[PDB]
Structure 1
């Protein structure tokens, strides 16, 4: 039953995706990005991302409305 929701969470990644840039993280599983609309945000993550693929200055993906890491 856990493996049903394990794949179910990735509906958020679907098509209409915008691009920001990683800046730093406050803690575990919550970070700060800066969008290419110019304004910075305090965002949430998606848990399947390997965190150790982050930060040279990492181009990321953001949800177009709720605006968190994708």
Structure 2
């Protein structure tokens, strides 16, 4: 879920969902699905989301 501009609560795959900021240049109409987001390890800063997986 997104709260504000380029910032969203995002389910993790490690064990702790987080509410992080994202790279703003990402098209705002692309963060709607629970698709394969990608962030930094510690910062957990969203860089982009990938459609496919698994």
TM-score (norm 2): 0.68
Greater helix share, 1 or 2?
1
Structure 1 residue runs of 5 or longer lacking an equivalent are 1-23
* Greater RCO (CA < 8 Å, at least 6 residues apart): 1
Following TM superposition, by how much is the alpha carbon of 1:44 offset from its aligned partner in structure 2, in angstroms?
A: 0.7
Structure showing greater radius of gyration is 1
TM-score (norm 1): 0.55
Structure 2 contact 6–21 (Cα < 8 Å) conserved? yes
Structure 1 runs (4+) greater than 3 angstroms displaced: none
Rounded Cα–Cα distance in structure 2 between residues aligned with 1:48 and 1:58: 17
Aligned to 1:47: 24
Following TM superposition, by how much is the alpha carbon of 1:62 offset from its aligned partner in structure 2, in angstroms?
A: 1.0
Following TM superposition, by how much is the alpha carbon of 1:59 offset from its aligned partner in structure 2, in angstroms?
A: 1.6
Structure 2 residue runs of 5 or longer lacking an equivalent are 46-53
